[PDB]
Amino acid sequence: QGSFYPDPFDVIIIGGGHAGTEAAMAAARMGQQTLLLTHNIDTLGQMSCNPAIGGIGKGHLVKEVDALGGLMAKAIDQAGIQFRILNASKGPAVRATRAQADRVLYRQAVRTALENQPNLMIFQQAVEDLIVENDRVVGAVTQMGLKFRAKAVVLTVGTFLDGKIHIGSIPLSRRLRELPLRVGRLKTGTPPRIDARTIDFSVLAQQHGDNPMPVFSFMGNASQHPQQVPCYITHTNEKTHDVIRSNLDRSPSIEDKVMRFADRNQHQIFLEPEGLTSNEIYPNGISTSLPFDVQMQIVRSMQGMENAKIVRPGYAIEYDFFDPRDLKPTLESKFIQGLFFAGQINGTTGYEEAAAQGLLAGLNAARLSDDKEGWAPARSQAYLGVLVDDLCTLGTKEPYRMFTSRAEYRLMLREDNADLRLTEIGRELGLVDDERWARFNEKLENIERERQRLKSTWVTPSAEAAAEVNAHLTAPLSREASGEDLLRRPEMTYEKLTTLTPFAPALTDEQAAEQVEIQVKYEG
Amino acid sequence: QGSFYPDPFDVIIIGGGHAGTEAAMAAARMGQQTLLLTHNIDTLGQMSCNPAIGGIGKGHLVKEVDALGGLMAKAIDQAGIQFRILNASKGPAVRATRAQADRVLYRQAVRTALENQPNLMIFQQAVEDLIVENDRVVGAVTQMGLKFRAKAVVLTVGTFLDGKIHIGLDSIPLSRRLRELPLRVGRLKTGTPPRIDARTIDFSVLAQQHGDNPMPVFSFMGNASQHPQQVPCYITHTNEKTHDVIRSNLDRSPPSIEDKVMRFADRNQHQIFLEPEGLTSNEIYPNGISTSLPFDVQMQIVRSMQGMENAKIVRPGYAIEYDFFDPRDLKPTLESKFIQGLFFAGQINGTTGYEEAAAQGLLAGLNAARLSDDKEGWAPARSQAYLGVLVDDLCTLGTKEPYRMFTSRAEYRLMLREDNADLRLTEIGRELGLVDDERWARFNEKLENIERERQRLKSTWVTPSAEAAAEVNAHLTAPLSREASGEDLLRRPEMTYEKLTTLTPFAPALTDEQAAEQVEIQVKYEG
C-alpha cells in the first residue's frame, strides 16, 4: 500500500455518467476486473435534462446499445411512462421509439443493476488526477488520497458540475490542458421546472402512449413497464415573445428559437411529468438563461398555466470539454495510451450517445486490458459508428436536422434490426449473455425458416381458396403468386396474409413476424 | 416586481431539514402561507446518520411529534424495513419503539408529503442571507438573487454542509451577520462508518435479529400493513485484533469506535450491527464502527471482524465538524433573542439526533406561524412532553439531556410515555391548529372508547359464587374471597386484558385495539 488500494484493476471508469454506466457495465460483463468511481452513488442514473429517453437517432443509439449488451434500454424499459413511436407511418429507417421516464424509477434501475453486476466494484470518490507513466495511464488518485492501479482507464466526467451556472483546481484538469488536447465551450440550458398543483390541466390537450405498448429493448416486454400517463400540451404567443424581446438586453433556448422565427407561428410546449411520484412538470422547450421574472412572465402567459407557480428556476450552464478530434475511433485518446474518453467530455449532451460511446470506450479499454483489440465500428455497421466517426472527424455529432434525409442513404440502419446488425459482433466481442444469445438465435431460426416458407408457398388462381385471397388484393390473382410476392403489395399486411388458408399458420414470435414483414415490404 | 417575488408569505422555512420539514409542514397545515426554501429537493428525507428512527427517548420524541400531527411518525411507517419495541418487559415508562429506514423509501415519503400539502410552496434555492429591518426578520434573499418577504422565518441549516470532512487527517453573509450579533458559537463533530458492500459479506455466520410479530406501528394513525417488506439486521462484533489495530493506529486523526476503545477493555468485544441501507440497495451500514481513522485502518477494522474478512468498502468512513450556535440565545419558544420572528430549530442549535430536530422543527414552525398571525409562542410544559423537556434544556442549559440519564429520570417523569402522547397532546394540538380532522376524529373515538371501557371495568364484578365463579377462579392464583371488579382482577400481575375478556363476566373484548392496550396500561400503572 504505497497508499494504494491493495488490489489492482483492469479498467477504471471515472464518473457515474450515462456513458460511465454503460462503460463500467460492459467492461464488467466482458469479464474484466472493473471499478467504477463516482463521486455520488446517489446521483447514479440522474437525468440532466428532460426526463425522456429516445426519439430520432437517440432511439437508434439505444436499440444499438441494447443489442451490444448494454443497460439504458432495460433501464428505460422499467421506468418509462408513455411509449410513443415517432414517424410511425414513414417506414423503418426513420421510425424511432421515444419513452418518458419516472426519474426515480430510472435512477433506481441504473443503480440496482450497476450495484448488482459481477466484476464491477463501485466506490464513492472524486478523482483527483490520473497516474500516467510513459504517456500510458496505470490508474488514478482519488481526492481522498487513495490510489488505484489499473491497466486501462475511461475518463468520463459525469454528473458533477462545475461549469458556471447562468441565470442572469483539480490537477487532472491542469494535466490534460498541459498536453495538446484542445478545449471547447458547450452551452446546455434548462426550463424552469414546474408545479403540477398550479397547472390547469383541463383547458390543455393530452398525448398518450401507443397501443399496444412498445418495448424498448429487444429482450424485454411491456409487462416490465410501469403505470403510464398523458403529457399535456400548451402553446406559446405574442405575449410570450414581447417579453423575451422586451427582456433580451439580458442574455437550444427560447431566447433563441424565438429571435429566429416570428410569432405567426406558436411554439408548441410540452408538459412532461418528471414522474409517477412528483408534482414536478418539465415544460419541454422553454429552457432559458432569462432571469426569474421573465421565466415566470413566460410560464405564466401560456394557456393552462395562468396561475403557475415555479418550483426550481431555469438556468443555463457552460461546460468545457475536450474536442474528440484527438480520439482514435475506439475512443482511446491519441495522447495517453489506454485512456479513453466517452461522454459529455467529448462535447455531446444526450443520454443516448453518451450511453453508446460509453459502451464502446468501456468495451475497448476492457479489451486493451485483456491484451486484445479495439473494435471501431464501421459507419455502416451502426449509428454508434456514424457517431464516433463524425466525432473523431469533424468532432461534433451530426445535427439531427440531417438525420431524417441523410437516413435514405443509410437505410439498413434501422431500429428494427439492431439486433441483427450488432448482436453477434456482440456475442463474438464478449458483450452478450448466453441467454440473450440464445434468444437472438430463436429470432433467427424463426425468420430464415418462415421466410423461405413464404416463397415455398404459392397460390394459383385455380386451387380451392383462390377466391378468398382475391378479396383482399388489388386486381385478383392472374399468376401463380407466392405470399412474399403479395405481402409486398401495399394494401396487404402479414397479419391478414396469415389468415388466408394456404398461408396459415400465423407466427408466434411477435418480432420475427414484425421483421419478416419489414424485411419483405423493403428488400428488392 | 421589485427584486422580490410578488406574493409575500407568512412564514418561510429556511433549509429543508428534519426540523426543517417538520416546521414547514406545521405552519402550512395551520393554514399559513408557508415557503420552504431548500438547495436540493432530492435530499428531503436525508438521514445522514444511520438509517434508523427512534429508540429510547427518540421514540418518545417521535410519538409526540406524531400526536402534535407532524410527519416523521407517518414517514418511518411508510418506509420501515424493521420494527422493534425496546424494553418490552420493562414497563411503560421506558418502552420505546425503533425502526430501520429504507433510505430511499423514507426520502420518498417525506418528499411526496411536503410536495402535496395545502399552503406549502417548496421552491429550491439556497439562501444568501436574511433581510432584516429593525431587529425583525422580514425576508430571506436567495443565492440566485430572488428576495421573499415573510412575517416570520425559521432558520434551519440542514440538508446541506459545509464541514471539512476528515478521513484520517485529510462564504454566505447569513453566516457573517449571525456572528455579528452576540451569538455564542460551538463546533460539534459527527462522523459515520465506512459503508460496506453487501456482497463482500459472509452473512452465513453472523446472527440476525428480526422485528416483532405482531408488528409495531409508529404513528397513532398508522396501520401495521402500511409498512414495506421486512428484512432482518445482522450482528457481528469487534475484537482484540480490531482494537489492537485502532490502538496501533491511533496516532492518526483525532459514538466513534476509536473512542469506544480508548475508553475500555476489549474482550472487550462490541456488538456491531449490520444495518440494511435500503430494500433496493446493496450497501450495509455497519452500525458502531464510525471513524476518522484512515481508509486502510478502516479496511483492517472491517476485515478483522467476523463475516467481514473479505468485505469490500463501498463508501469510506469519516467525520465532519459543524459550526453551530448556542441555543441559549433563544426564548423557550425558539424565537431568537436578537432578531425577532427568527426561529432556530434542530441542528443549528447543536442537537444532532433526527427525532430531536424533528421535534424542534414542529414547535419552531408552530410558534413561527403563530407569530405570523400575531399570537404567542407556545412553550411546552416540561411536564407535558419530552418535547417540553428537550426545548427547556436548550435554553436553560444550552444542551440536550443525555440518553445515559434517560432510564433513571424515566420514572420521575413517568406520565410521559410513548403509549400516551396523543392523550397528552393531540388535544392541545387541536386548539393550536396542528391536528387534522382525519385524526381529531380518530383520537376522540379512542378517547371515549377508553372511558366507556374503564367505567364498565367497575360496572362489572364477580361475587365468589353464582354464574362462572368457576371459569374465573382457575385463571388466577388465589380465588376471590368476596367482590372484585374487572379492573381489580386486571391490576393482578397474572392476568392480561385479552385473557380478562375471554371470561363471561367481563367480555366481550373491546375492538378499538389501541384503546384496549391503553386501558390495560392505564390500569396496571395508575399508581
PDB file of C-alpha atoms in Angstrom, chain B residues 227-451:
ATOM      1  CA  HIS B 227     -45.107  -0.978   6.167  1.00  0.00           C
ATOM      2  CA  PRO B 228     -42.691  -2.130   3.411  1.00  0.00           C
ATOM      3  CA  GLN B 229     -41.271  -5.638   3.337  1.00  0.00           C
ATOM      4  CA  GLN B 230     -39.364  -6.609   6.447  1.00  0.00           C
ATOM      5  CA  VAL B 231     -35.691  -7.678   6.375  1.00  0.00           C
ATOM      6  CA  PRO B 232     -33.550  -8.711   9.403  1.00  0.00           C
ATOM      7  CA  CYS B 233     -30.377  -6.956  10.680  1.00  0.00           C
ATOM      8  CA  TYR B 234     -27.115  -8.737  11.092  1.00  0.00           C
ATOM      9  CA  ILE B 235     -24.840  -8.842  14.144  1.00  0.00           C
ATOM     10  CA  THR B 236     -21.083  -9.333  14.122  1.00  0.00           C
ATOM     11  CA  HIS B 237     -18.749  -7.967  16.805  1.00  0.00           C
ATOM     12  CA  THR B 238     -15.447  -6.306  17.063  1.00  0.00           C
ATOM     13  CA  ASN B 239     -12.440  -7.940  18.799  1.00  0.00           C
ATOM     14  CA  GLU B 240      -8.919  -7.865  20.107  1.00  0.00           C
ATOM     15  CA  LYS B 241      -7.151  -7.582  16.723  1.00  0.00           C
ATOM     16  CA  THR B 242      -9.608  -4.907  15.720  1.00  0.00           C
ATOM     17  CA  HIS B 243      -8.771  -2.814  18.698  1.00  0.00           C
ATOM     18  CA  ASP B 244      -5.127  -3.714  18.516  1.00  0.00           C
ATOM     19  CA  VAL B 245      -5.416  -2.074  15.148  1.00  0.00           C
ATOM     20  CA  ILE B 246      -7.222   1.030  16.326  1.00  0.00           C
ATOM     21  CA  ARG B 247      -4.654   1.475  19.109  1.00  0.00           C
ATOM     22  CA  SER B 248      -1.588   0.936  16.989  1.00  0.00           C
ATOM     23  CA  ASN B 249      -3.070   3.355  14.530  1.00  0.00           C
ATOM     24  CA  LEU B 250      -4.444   5.994  16.894  1.00  0.00           C
ATOM     25  CA  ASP B 251      -1.579   8.416  16.019  1.00  0.00           C
ATOM     26  CA  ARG B 252      -3.862   9.206  13.073  1.00  0.00           C
ATOM     27  CA  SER B 253      -6.702  11.639  13.298  1.00  0.00           C
ATOM     28  CA  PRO B 254      -8.138  12.924  16.482  1.00  0.00           C
ATOM     29  CA  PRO B 255     -20.064   7.187  19.250  1.00  0.00           C
ATOM     30  CA  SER B 256     -16.930   6.626  17.128  1.00  0.00           C
ATOM     31  CA  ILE B 257     -15.191   3.347  17.628  1.00  0.00           C
ATOM     32  CA  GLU B 258     -11.706   4.612  18.063  1.00  0.00           C
ATOM     33  CA  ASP B 259     -13.342   6.299  21.030  1.00  0.00           C
ATOM     34  CA  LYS B 260     -15.326   3.349  22.218  1.00  0.00           C
ATOM     35  CA  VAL B 261     -11.933   1.807  22.710  1.00  0.00           C
ATOM     36  CA  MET B 262      -9.638   4.424  24.032  1.00  0.00           C
ATOM     37  CA  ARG B 263     -12.176   4.027  26.851  1.00  0.00           C
ATOM     38  CA  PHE B 264     -12.107   0.292  27.882  1.00  0.00           C
ATOM     39  CA  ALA B 265     -11.303  -3.417  27.723  1.00  0.00           C
ATOM     40  CA  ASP B 266     -11.968  -5.276  24.727  1.00  0.00           C
ATOM     41  CA  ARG B 267     -12.626  -8.854  25.246  1.00  0.00           C
ATOM     42  CA  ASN B 268     -13.981  -6.368  25.169  1.00  0.00           C
ATOM     43  CA  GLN B 269     -15.901  -7.244  22.115  1.00  0.00           C
ATOM     44  CA  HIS B 270     -18.574  -4.704  20.935  1.00  0.00           C
ATOM     45  CA  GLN B 271     -21.732  -5.943  19.219  1.00  0.00           C
ATOM     46  CA  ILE B 272     -21.654  -4.229  15.797  1.00  0.00           C
ATOM     47  CA  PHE B 273     -24.936  -4.061  13.872  1.00  0.00           C
ATOM     48  CA  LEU B 274     -25.124  -4.707  10.149  1.00  0.00           C
ATOM     49  CA  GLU B 275     -27.976  -2.416   9.079  1.00  0.00           C
ATOM     50  CA  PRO B 276     -29.576  -2.670   5.514  1.00  0.00           C
ATOM     51  CA  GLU B 277     -29.120   0.650   3.781  1.00  0.00           C
ATOM     52  CA  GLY B 278     -32.306   0.129   1.831  1.00  0.00           C
ATOM     53  CA  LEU B 279     -34.549  -2.524   0.397  1.00  0.00           C
ATOM     54  CA  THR B 280     -33.078  -1.968  -3.052  1.00  0.00           C
ATOM     55  CA  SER B 281     -29.516  -1.198  -2.021  1.00  0.00           C
ATOM     56  CA  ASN B 282     -26.521  -3.349  -1.563  1.00  0.00           C
ATOM     57  CA  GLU B 283     -24.821  -1.081   0.940  1.00  0.00           C
ATOM     58  CA  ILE B 284     -24.698  -2.206   4.549  1.00  0.00           C
ATOM     59  CA  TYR B 285     -24.322   0.267   7.459  1.00  0.00           C
ATOM     60  CA  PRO B 286     -22.022  -1.319   9.994  1.00  0.00           C
ATOM     61  CA  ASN B 287     -23.516   0.457  12.920  1.00  0.00           C
ATOM     62  CA  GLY B 288     -20.976   1.161  15.602  1.00  0.00           C
ATOM     63  CA  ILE B 289     -17.671   1.383  13.738  1.00  0.00           C
ATOM     64  CA  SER B 290     -17.725   5.055  12.681  1.00  0.00           C
ATOM     65  CA  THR B 291     -14.323   6.778  12.285  1.00  0.00           C
ATOM     66  CA  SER B 292     -11.917   9.378  11.082  1.00  0.00           C
ATOM     67  CA  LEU B 293      -9.139   6.811  11.089  1.00  0.00           C
ATOM     68  CA  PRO B 294      -7.625   6.435   7.590  1.00  0.00           C
ATOM     69  CA  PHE B 295      -9.035   4.163   4.868  1.00  0.00           C
ATOM     70  CA  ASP B 296      -6.728   1.169   5.396  1.00  0.00           C
ATOM     71  CA  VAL B 297      -7.144   1.341   9.059  1.00  0.00           C
ATOM     72  CA  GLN B 298     -10.876   1.253   8.330  1.00  0.00           C
ATOM     73  CA  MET B 299     -10.387  -1.643   5.994  1.00  0.00           C
ATOM     74  CA  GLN B 300      -8.405  -3.524   8.620  1.00  0.00           C
ATOM     75  CA  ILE B 301     -11.051  -2.729  11.211  1.00  0.00           C
ATOM     76  CA  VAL B 302     -13.719  -4.092   8.906  1.00  0.00           C
ATOM     77  CA  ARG B 303     -11.802  -7.104   7.851  1.00  0.00           C
ATOM     78  CA  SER B 304     -10.778  -8.107  11.350  1.00  0.00           C
ATOM     79  CA  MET B 305     -14.381  -8.717  12.073  1.00  0.00           C
ATOM     80  CA  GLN B 306     -16.268 -11.955  11.737  1.00  0.00           C
ATOM     81  CA  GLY B 307     -18.064 -12.074   8.453  1.00  0.00           C
ATOM     82  CA  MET B 308     -16.191  -9.169   7.017  1.00  0.00           C
ATOM     83  CA  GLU B 309     -12.872 -10.905   6.301  1.00  0.00           C
ATOM     84  CA  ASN B 310     -13.410 -10.309   2.602  1.00  0.00           C
ATOM     85  CA  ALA B 311     -15.699  -7.293   2.787  1.00  0.00           C
ATOM     86  CA  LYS B 312     -15.021  -4.507   0.464  1.00  0.00           C
ATOM     87  CA  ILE B 313     -15.853  -0.934   1.246  1.00  0.00           C
ATOM     88  CA  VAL B 314     -18.323   0.930  -0.984  1.00  0.00           C
ATOM     89  CA  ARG B 315     -18.126   4.368   0.780  1.00  0.00           C
ATOM     90  CA  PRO B 316     -15.334   5.288   3.100  1.00  0.00           C
ATOM     91  CA  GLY B 317     -15.907   6.167   6.794  1.00  0.00           C
ATOM     92  CA  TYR B 318     -15.227   9.798   8.014  1.00  0.00           C
ATOM     93  CA  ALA B 319     -16.279  12.628  10.300  1.00  0.00           C
ATOM     94  CA  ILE B 320     -17.373  16.222   9.806  1.00  0.00           C
ATOM     95  CA  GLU B 321     -17.135  19.215  12.077  1.00  0.00           C
ATOM     96  CA  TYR B 322     -20.150  21.573  12.195  1.00  0.00           C
ATOM     97  CA  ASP B 323     -20.221  25.122  13.436  1.00  0.00           C
ATOM     98  CA  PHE B 324     -23.460  25.696  15.397  1.00  0.00           C
ATOM     99  CA  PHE B 325     -24.906  28.427  17.612  1.00  0.00           C
ATOM    100  CA  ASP B 326     -25.624  28.057  21.247  1.00  0.00           C
ATOM    101  CA  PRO B 327     -29.352  27.725  21.764  1.00  0.00           C
ATOM    102  CA  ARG B 328     -29.265  29.738  24.980  1.00  0.00           C
ATOM    103  CA  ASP B 329     -29.951  32.764  22.793  1.00  0.00           C
ATOM    104  CA  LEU B 330     -33.453  31.514  22.082  1.00  0.00           C
ATOM    105  CA  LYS B 331     -36.624  32.200  24.027  1.00  0.00           C
ATOM    106  CA  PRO B 332     -38.172  28.978  25.258  1.00  0.00           C
ATOM    107  CA  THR B 333     -40.214  29.233  22.088  1.00  0.00           C
ATOM    108  CA  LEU B 334     -37.059  29.048  19.884  1.00  0.00           C
ATOM    109  CA  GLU B 335     -37.627  32.567  18.921  1.00  0.00           C
ATOM    110  CA  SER B 336     -34.177  34.140  18.884  1.00  0.00           C
ATOM    111  CA  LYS B 337     -33.439  36.810  21.464  1.00  0.00           C
ATOM    112  CA  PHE B 338     -31.584  39.020  18.979  1.00  0.00           C
ATOM    113  CA  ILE B 339     -33.677  39.231  15.836  1.00  0.00           C
ATOM    114  CA  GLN B 340     -37.401  38.778  16.367  1.00  0.00           C
ATOM    115  CA  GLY B 341     -39.542  36.435  14.311  1.00  0.00           C
ATOM    116  CA  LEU B 342     -36.398  34.367  13.664  1.00  0.00           C
ATOM    117  CA  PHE B 343     -36.583  30.811  14.931  1.00  0.00           C
ATOM    118  CA  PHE B 344     -33.834  28.268  15.323  1.00  0.00           C
ATOM    119  CA  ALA B 345     -34.568  24.601  15.056  1.00  0.00           C
ATOM    120  CA  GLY B 346     -32.759  21.308  15.107  1.00  0.00           C
ATOM    121  CA  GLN B 347     -29.050  21.121  14.389  1.00  0.00           C
ATOM    122  CA  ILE B 348     -28.343  24.720  14.004  1.00  0.00           C
ATOM    123  CA  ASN B 349     -28.938  24.505  17.750  1.00  0.00           C
ATOM    124  CA  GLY B 350     -26.397  21.758  18.267  1.00  0.00           C
ATOM    125  CA  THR B 351     -28.673  18.788  18.738  1.00  0.00           C
ATOM    126  CA  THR B 352     -27.898  16.090  16.246  1.00  0.00           C
ATOM    127  CA  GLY B 353     -30.488  13.435  16.687  1.00  0.00           C
ATOM    128  CA  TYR B 354     -33.126  13.417  13.906  1.00  0.00           C
ATOM    129  CA  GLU B 355     -36.058  12.931  16.228  1.00  0.00           C
ATOM    130  CA  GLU B 356     -34.613  15.765  18.279  1.00  0.00           C
ATOM    131  CA  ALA B 357     -34.717  18.076  15.265  1.00  0.00           C
ATOM    132  CA  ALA B 358     -37.987  16.696  14.024  1.00  0.00           C
ATOM    133  CA  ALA B 359     -39.463  17.794  17.414  1.00  0.00           C
ATOM    134  CA  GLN B 360     -37.707  21.166  17.445  1.00  0.00           C
ATOM    135  CA  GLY B 361     -38.925  21.990  13.952  1.00  0.00           C
ATOM    136  CA  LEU B 362     -42.540  21.251  14.711  1.00  0.00           C
ATOM    137  CA  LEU B 363     -42.550  23.770  17.512  1.00  0.00           C
ATOM    138  CA  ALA B 364     -40.385  26.225  15.717  1.00  0.00           C
ATOM    139  CA  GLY B 365     -42.725  26.081  12.785  1.00  0.00           C
ATOM    140  CA  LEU B 366     -45.685  26.390  15.144  1.00  0.00           C
ATOM    141  CA  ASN B 367     -44.537  29.444  17.019  1.00  0.00           C
ATOM    142  CA  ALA B 368     -43.242  30.901  13.827  1.00  0.00           C
ATOM    143  CA  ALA B 369     -46.680  30.634  12.216  1.00  0.00           C
ATOM    144  CA  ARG B 370     -48.461  31.872  15.341  1.00  0.00           C
ATOM    145  CA  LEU B 371     -46.302  34.943  15.286  1.00  0.00           C
ATOM    146  CA  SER B 372     -47.232  35.233  11.635  1.00  0.00           C
ATOM    147  CA  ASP B 373     -50.923  35.732  12.789  1.00  0.00           C
ATOM    148  CA  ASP B 374     -49.722  37.583  15.969  1.00  0.00           C
ATOM    149  CA  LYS B 375     -50.067  35.018  18.681  1.00  0.00           C
ATOM    150  CA  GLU B 376     -47.791  33.932  21.456  1.00  0.00           C
ATOM    151  CA  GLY B 377     -45.340  31.115  21.015  1.00  0.00           C
ATOM    152  CA  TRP B 378     -46.466  28.029  22.816  1.00  0.00           C
ATOM    153  CA  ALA B 379     -43.597  26.969  25.045  1.00  0.00           C
ATOM    154  CA  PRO B 380     -44.416  23.392  26.000  1.00  0.00           C
ATOM    155  CA  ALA B 381     -44.604  22.183  29.601  1.00  0.00           C
ATOM    156  CA  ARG B 382     -41.565  20.090  30.730  1.00  0.00           C
ATOM    157  CA  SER B 383     -44.120  18.014  32.433  1.00  0.00           C
ATOM    158  CA  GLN B 384     -46.337  17.836  29.310  1.00  0.00           C
ATOM    159  CA  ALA B 385     -43.959  16.139  26.899  1.00  0.00           C
ATOM    160  CA  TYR B 386     -40.396  15.229  26.389  1.00  0.00           C
ATOM    161  CA  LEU B 387     -40.745  17.830  23.592  1.00  0.00           C
ATOM    162  CA  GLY B 388     -41.200  20.054  26.615  1.00  0.00           C
ATOM    163  CA  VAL B 389     -38.088  18.822  28.381  1.00  0.00           C
ATOM    164  CA  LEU B 390     -35.811  18.966  25.363  1.00  0.00           C
ATOM    165  CA  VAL B 391     -36.663  22.537  24.428  1.00  0.00           C
ATOM    166  CA  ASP B 392     -36.438  23.718  28.044  1.00  0.00           C
ATOM    167  CA  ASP B 393     -32.853  22.394  28.227  1.00  0.00           C
ATOM    168  CA  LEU B 394     -31.550  24.030  25.083  1.00  0.00           C
ATOM    169  CA  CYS B 395     -32.439  27.291  26.821  1.00  0.00           C
ATOM    170  CA  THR B 396     -31.743  26.623  30.400  1.00  0.00           C
ATOM    171  CA  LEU B 397     -28.549  24.790  29.823  1.00  0.00           C
ATOM    172  CA  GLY B 398     -27.691  25.101  26.215  1.00  0.00           C
ATOM    173  CA  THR B 399     -27.835  21.418  25.928  1.00  0.00           C
ATOM    174  CA  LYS B 400     -29.830  18.325  25.348  1.00  0.00           C
ATOM    175  CA  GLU B 401     -30.120  15.978  28.324  1.00  0.00           C
ATOM    176  CA  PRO B 402     -28.058  12.759  27.800  1.00  0.00           C
ATOM    177  CA  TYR B 403     -29.664   9.434  26.958  1.00  0.00           C
ATOM    178  CA  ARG B 404     -27.404   7.850  29.609  1.00  0.00           C
ATOM    179  CA  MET B 405     -29.746   9.558  32.075  1.00  0.00           C
ATOM    180  CA  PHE B 406     -32.983   8.701  30.357  1.00  0.00           C
ATOM    181  CA  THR B 407     -33.741   5.445  32.200  1.00  0.00           C
ATOM    182  CA  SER B 408     -33.484   6.905  35.725  1.00  0.00           C
ATOM    183  CA  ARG B 409     -35.264  10.155  35.155  1.00  0.00           C
ATOM    184  CA  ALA B 410     -37.636   7.876  33.310  1.00  0.00           C
ATOM    185  CA  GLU B 411     -39.545   7.321  36.476  1.00  0.00           C
ATOM    186  CA  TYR B 412     -39.587  10.841  37.816  1.00  0.00           C
ATOM    187  CA  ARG B 413     -41.161  11.880  34.544  1.00  0.00           C
ATOM    188  CA  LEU B 414     -43.463   8.936  34.022  1.00  0.00           C
ATOM    189  CA  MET B 415     -46.761  10.027  32.672  1.00  0.00           C
ATOM    190  CA  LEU B 416     -44.524  10.867  29.760  1.00  0.00           C
ATOM    191  CA  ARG B 417     -44.779   7.599  27.948  1.00  0.00           C
ATOM    192  CA  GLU B 418     -44.847   6.729  24.270  1.00  0.00           C
ATOM    193  CA  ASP B 419     -48.163   4.889  24.607  1.00  0.00           C
ATOM    194  CA  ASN B 420     -49.861   8.059  25.512  1.00  0.00           C
ATOM    195  CA  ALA B 421     -48.574  11.113  23.707  1.00  0.00           C
ATOM    196  CA  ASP B 422     -51.928  11.545  21.935  1.00  0.00           C
ATOM    197  CA  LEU B 423     -53.694  11.596  25.281  1.00  0.00           C
ATOM    198  CA  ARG B 424     -51.109  14.044  26.469  1.00  0.00           C
ATOM    199  CA  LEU B 425     -51.050  16.213  23.346  1.00  0.00           C
ATOM    200  CA  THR B 426     -53.292  15.819  20.269  1.00  0.00           C
ATOM    201  CA  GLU B 427     -55.905  17.827  22.247  1.00  0.00           C
ATOM    202  CA  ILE B 428     -53.638  20.810  22.799  1.00  0.00           C
ATOM    203  CA  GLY B 429     -52.954  20.088  19.187  1.00  0.00           C
ATOM    204  CA  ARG B 430     -56.489  20.644  18.128  1.00  0.00           C
ATOM    205  CA  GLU B 431     -56.583  24.078  19.572  1.00  0.00           C
ATOM    206  CA  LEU B 432     -53.173  25.076  18.314  1.00  0.00           C
ATOM    207  CA  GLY B 433     -54.113  24.290  14.757  1.00  0.00           C
ATOM    208  CA  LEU B 434     -51.834  21.331  14.455  1.00  0.00           C
ATOM    209  CA  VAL B 435     -54.277  18.499  14.240  1.00  0.00           C
ATOM    210  CA  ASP B 436     -56.233  17.181  11.308  1.00  0.00           C
ATOM    211  CA  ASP B 437     -59.898  16.142  11.051  1.00  0.00           C
ATOM    212  CA  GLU B 438     -58.801  12.797   9.880  1.00  0.00           C
ATOM    213  CA  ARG B 439     -57.068  12.488  13.257  1.00  0.00           C
ATOM    214  CA  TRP B 440     -59.137  14.577  15.647  1.00  0.00           C
ATOM    215  CA  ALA B 441     -61.884  12.178  14.686  1.00  0.00           C
ATOM    216  CA  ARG B 442     -59.938   9.051  15.498  1.00  0.00           C
ATOM    217  CA  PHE B 443     -58.456  10.471  18.578  1.00  0.00           C
ATOM    218  CA  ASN B 444     -61.777  11.163  20.295  1.00  0.00           C
ATOM    219  CA  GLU B 445     -63.125   7.826  19.184  1.00  0.00           C
ATOM    220  CA  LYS B 446     -60.205   6.273  21.054  1.00  0.00           C
ATOM    221  CA  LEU B 447     -60.725   8.756  23.853  1.00  0.00           C
ATOM    222  CA  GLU B 448     -64.411   7.930  24.569  1.00  0.00           C
ATOM    223  CA  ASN B 449     -63.583   4.419  23.656  1.00  0.00           C
ATOM    224  CA  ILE B 450     -61.312   4.104  26.667  1.00  0.00           C
ATOM    225  CA  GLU B 451     -63.586   5.939  29.057  1.00  0.00           C
TER     226      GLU B 451
END
